Design a protein around this nucleic acid. Sequence first.
RNA 1: GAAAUUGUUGAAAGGGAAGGGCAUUUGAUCAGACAUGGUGUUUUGUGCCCUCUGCUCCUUGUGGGUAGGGGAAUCUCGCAU
Length: 220
Amino acid sequence: NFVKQLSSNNRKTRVNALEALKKYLTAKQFKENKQIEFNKLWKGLYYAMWFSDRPRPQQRLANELGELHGLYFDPKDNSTADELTTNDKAFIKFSRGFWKVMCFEWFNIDRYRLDKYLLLIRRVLFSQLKYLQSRNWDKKLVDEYIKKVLRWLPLSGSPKVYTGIPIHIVDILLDEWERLLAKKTPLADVIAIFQDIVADYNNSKVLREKIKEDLFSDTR
RNA sequence: GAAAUUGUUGAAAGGGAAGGGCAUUUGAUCAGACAUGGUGUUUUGUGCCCUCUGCUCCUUGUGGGUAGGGGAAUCUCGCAU
């Protein structure tokens, strides 16, 4: 498998396992189904960052773990009012599991490696984000993708998600929004989600007041 | 080879009590640095220094160890005078 090669204790078989995962992601004929296989892939990539300690190789590794949303379903096919055709259909299963992995992991990360996963989740939100598609508009990708962002990670009507990751997404999605390079994009519907969180009672004050200051106070 | 206790020697005290506490003098006596620089300039001379050529352990850059020559006319980078 790849969960034993990405979670190895050897550096060389983890780099070679990443390159065989590059060939495995450009071998698109086998990644057709089975959500939990993608969940296991993101758990192996989670450990594959977890063994990297030095700052320059962990930034190279975060950049290429973001780039794995780019090799897997590159934009070139560039579908026309084509709903979800083998570059956008399976991609969403590669996104959700990542957030699911972080939804499983936010207790179990210590005070010295948590910067790696703040920076990692910065790069990965920027990269899915960059692959809405090559352009920032694909409409059923926007509402289906925003349903498979809304329905898991900024739920904020469920306490099952850990409250540090939506406030970190609030801290990063503006600068990493405008890393895409004043234009008009489906941003506001995204912001409507946060307005839903301000509309949602039966929550804690932090989500309610920290997005209500941090996200809405931005003049951009 | 402890104390009680005994002798000798030395010191001290003693007009019908000593030993104790607070404080001090006198007499006797013991402590009391193989401490020695620090800083800023200037001769030189070396090296892990500059430069030429390398070799080797491993993990991510912000690596480590270790040879052969040359060169101070630049360099305090360090250490010696």
